[PDB]
Design a binder for this molecule. Structure first.
Ligand code: ZN
Ligand code: ZN
Ligand code: ZN
Lengths: 162, 162
């Protein structure tokens, strides 16, 4: 086995996995934001209640959604992941577009807990203000991560293979 | 060159860099939240102004700070990154604690843009409500990222060296 070609592929594949991890983690940060809906920091580990003032929180989620698209475009291409990358990107753009289009209810300081959940809480029943797109975006990145990790693991096992 | 010994090492190292990348990205997400201070969503790429209602945003940052500590604590280490991980974990705890201590100014929906920046804008002139701790944590995680990267880059170099 040519150690030169394998080491190169390992390095390249690992860079791809790390790039996808950034995207995956940003989605994770939004899920954490969702748990802060209708809450306020009290003097405890647990948060206190303060309903319907989720505007700044939603603005934060919105900026992260734009960063996500930029990170997806930062993944080094090679065709092998073209399909997965394109799907994740369009879904990330759809999510951001949905949040923008719902600015009537999401673009003000007084965003209600209920509307905030329809936008960023994937486990909400009503996902009509962005949550639906977020859920799909989660799946597309999940499929992208599996394919990426697959290329990495396969590149490494080439060292000991057969 | 025990390829089976080097491969297991590369696999382990890849797992550490990935875990650290997750922590690093959560920090990036807080920096993105800082950019939403005093802003609201509108039908455009750029946010509009909506000053002094950053409470929900701060609660989101708070939950992410606790997630960061959990992620750091779950990283696998045999002692090579012993020091780096401990420092990062301690600084992450200090950041969360600082925010809790400022619950009076940060625990309400009407958090002023000025106080929000003292809490999560690491480049702010006044960093007395958490931003000082945030910057220390940011640097500590970068130190951890560098150390992890080197551990991985070296294990991979063993393929074409000596
Ligand atoms: Zn109120
Ligand atoms: Zn106001
Ligand atoms: Zn107090």
């Amino acid at each position: 086995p040519n150690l030169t070609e394998i080491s190169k592929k390992i390095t390249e594949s690992n860079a791809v996995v790390l790039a996808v991890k950034e995207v995956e983690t940003l989605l994770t940060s939004i899920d954490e934001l969702a748990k802060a809906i209708g809450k306020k920091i009290k003097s405890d580990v647990s948060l206190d209640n303060e309903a319907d003032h989720n505007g700044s929180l939603m603005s934060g989620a919105y900026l992260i959604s734009t960063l996500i698209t930029k990170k997806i475009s930062a993944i080094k291409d090679s065709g092998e992941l073209k399909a997965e990358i394109e799907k994740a990107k369009k879904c990330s753009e759809e999510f951001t577009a949905k949040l923008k289009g719902e600015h009537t209810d999401l673009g003000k300081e007084g965003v209600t807990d209920d509307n905030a959940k329809k936008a960023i809480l994937k486990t909400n029943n009503d996902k009509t203000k962005g949550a639906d797109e977020l859920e799909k975006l989660f799946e597309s990145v999940k499929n992208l991560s599996k394919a990426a990790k697959e290329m990495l693991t396969n590149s490494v096992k080439e060292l000991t293979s057969p």
